[PDB]
Amino acid sequence: DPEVTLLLQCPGGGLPQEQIQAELSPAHDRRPLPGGDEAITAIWETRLKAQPWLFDAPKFRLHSATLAPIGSRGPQLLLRLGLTSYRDFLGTNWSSSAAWLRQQGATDWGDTQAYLADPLGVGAALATADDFLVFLRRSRQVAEAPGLVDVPGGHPEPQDLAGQLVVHELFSSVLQEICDEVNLPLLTLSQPLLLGIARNETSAGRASAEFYVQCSLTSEQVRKHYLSGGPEAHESTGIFFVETQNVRRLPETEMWAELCPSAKGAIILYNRVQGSPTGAALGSPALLPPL
Ligand SMILES: CC(=O)N1CCC(C#N)CC1
Numbered sequence: 649d650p651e652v653t654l655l656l657q658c659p660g661g662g663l664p665q666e667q668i669q670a671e672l673s674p675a676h677d678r679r680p681l682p683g684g685d686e687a688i689t690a691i692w693e694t695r696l697k698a699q700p701w702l703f704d705a706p707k708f709r710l711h712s713a714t715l716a717p718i719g720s721r722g723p724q725l726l727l728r729l730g731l732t733s734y735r736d737f738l739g740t741n742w743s744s745s746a747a748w749l750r751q752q753g754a755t756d757w758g759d760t761q762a763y764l765a766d767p768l769g770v771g772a773a774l775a776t777a778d779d780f781l782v783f784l785r786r787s788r789q790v791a792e793a794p795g796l797v798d799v800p801g802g803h804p805e806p807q808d809l810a811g812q813l814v815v816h817e818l819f820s821s822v823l824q825e826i827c828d829e830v831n832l833p834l835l836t837l838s839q840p841l842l843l844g845i846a847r848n849e850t851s852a853g854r855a856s857a858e859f860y861v862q863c864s865l866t867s868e869q870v871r872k873h874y875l876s877g878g879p880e881a882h883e884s885t886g887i888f889f890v891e892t893q894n895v896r897r898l899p900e901t902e903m904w905a906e907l908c909p910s911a912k913g914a915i916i917l918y919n920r921v922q923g924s925p926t927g928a929a930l931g932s933p934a935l936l937p938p939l
Pocket residue numbers: 707733734737767791792803851
């Protein structure tokens with residue numbers, strides 16, 4: 649799967665909010681382009697003169713994420729974050745020249761991402777009470793990965809002593825994205841666990857934090873809530889469910905070729921961090937069938 653790379657695999661079956669620190673610093677921002685940020689401004693102008701109802705929004709930028717030594721006490725992860733925008737994304741990662749910016753970043757800064765917006769996404773492996781994961785079909789008329797399969801998620805918009813508020817907005821945003829798109833009540837959802845961070849190599853290396861969330865409703869009740877919003881309550885065109893039993897071999901199915909890179913990231917991290925048992929009981933052959 650060349651279109652997805654793992655940046656972080658979390659320990660302990662995944663990390664809760666209270667074990668993560670963030671450092672939000674202008675040292676973690678995109679570097680100005682070599683010939684100047686006028687090139688981003690020019691792309692934006694062209695776009696607004698065709699689609700004048702579009703608007704900019706601030707986004708978090710991922711610089712890097714450092715895991716503590718495994719088995720340690722105290723905070724287990726440091727997220728190094730900067731700020732970027734939807735405009736900066738359109739002028740860098742989305743640009744036809746994005747590969748030239750990556751080579752220039754290697755040359756000038758020893759950092760393939762130095763000249764890229766790299767907005768941070770969130771996604772969820774969302775499990776039902778009857779042990780299915782939740783999938784969504786993308787519209788064939790959208791910009792990103794038209795007609796492909798996705799999981800619930802989005803790109804959070806901003807508003808350890810500013811840090812803890814930032815970690816809170818990241819965990820809050822994955823629940824809000826599930827409530828807005830799947831139409832589920834907030835009280836049916838568990839507190840999220842962070843599984844890891846995946847990069848989309850088809851969008852010049854931008855990263856998404858992938859979370860595990862449990863729902864107290866069955867697949868049938870989740871479907872009812874999604875459909876009862878009507879066509880205007882969701883951006884997706886359909887919902888469907890795969891047994892957690894069968895997610896283990898999803899990369900061997902015809903479904904895999906239809907998954908967008910960020911959904912492939914969520915399923916790889918679910919399989920490595922929540923699947924793949926380590927103990928004698930769950931590792932026994934009748935519960936973990938060989939092949
Ligand atoms: C690929 C695409 O269109 N996206 C994903 C990145 C996000 C930002 N910023 C919103 C739009």
